[PDB]
Amino acid sequence: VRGLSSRISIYWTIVKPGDVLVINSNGNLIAPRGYFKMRTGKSSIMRSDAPIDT
């Protein structure tokens, strides 16, 4: 795929307030650069090809 026979597998970890992340590796780590801020609310996702009007 795009020249490549190798792959990256993606994982995720959520860390709550007062907890801590530890990353321990001796090779093959694709490291995070930071974190995404989690929110709760009314957001969602939908698959559609419909145009978006005003």
Partner: protein, 172 residues
């Protein structure tokens, strides 16, 4: 309908009654005429608007839910997701069918009812001065001019004024 007035002892509706749902037609010494009954018309209309507003009130608001279409076969978890959705849809579809069936039966019966109530109220005003001809018409046994007819229509008819005349015509 349950009351047997509409499509009953009232043989048919009036396409020419265009200013109301229920009303009166008369023939007297001054000619013939027609008038809508406002109270009965509005009672039926008010009930129907009541049930309509109860039905079209408050759709539910839902946001993030479960996926309902899938591009790969997955087995057990997808099976369950699809079954949950199908089950939900069949239940709501049943609710919709039943809701309109019950509401509509009841709408027919309540309008039939309003027709019957107007008929009974008129009969009661007339006391011994009229007889029910059985087709939703009263034969009034005294001279009853346009103002008299209007007194019946507006609920102020005074039967005692006409009682001697009417009884003489009915029974002798």
């Amino acid at each position: 309908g349950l009351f047997g007035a509409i499509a009953g002892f009232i043989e048919n509706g009036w396409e020419g009654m265009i200013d109301g749902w229920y009303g009166f037609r008369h023939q007297n010494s001054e000619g013939t005429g027609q008038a809508a009954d406002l109270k009965s018309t509005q009672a039926a209309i008010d009930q129907i608007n009541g049930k309509l507003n109860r039905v079209i009130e408050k759709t539910n608001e839902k946001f993030h839910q479960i996926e309902k279409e899938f591009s790969e076969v997955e087995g057990r978890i997808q099976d369950l997701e699809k079954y949950v959705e199908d089950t939900k849809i069949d239940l709501w579809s049943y609710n919709a069918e039943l809701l309109v069936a019950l509401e509509n039966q009841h709408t027919i019966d309540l309008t039939d009812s309003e027709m019957n109530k107007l008929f009974e109220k008129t009969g009661r005003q007339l006391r011994e001065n009229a007889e029910d001809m059985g087709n939703g018409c009263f034969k009034i046994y005294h001279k009853c001019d346009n103002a008299c007819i209007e007194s019946i229509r507006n609920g102020t008819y005074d039967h005692d004024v006409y009682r001697d005349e009417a009884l003489n015509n009915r029974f002798q």
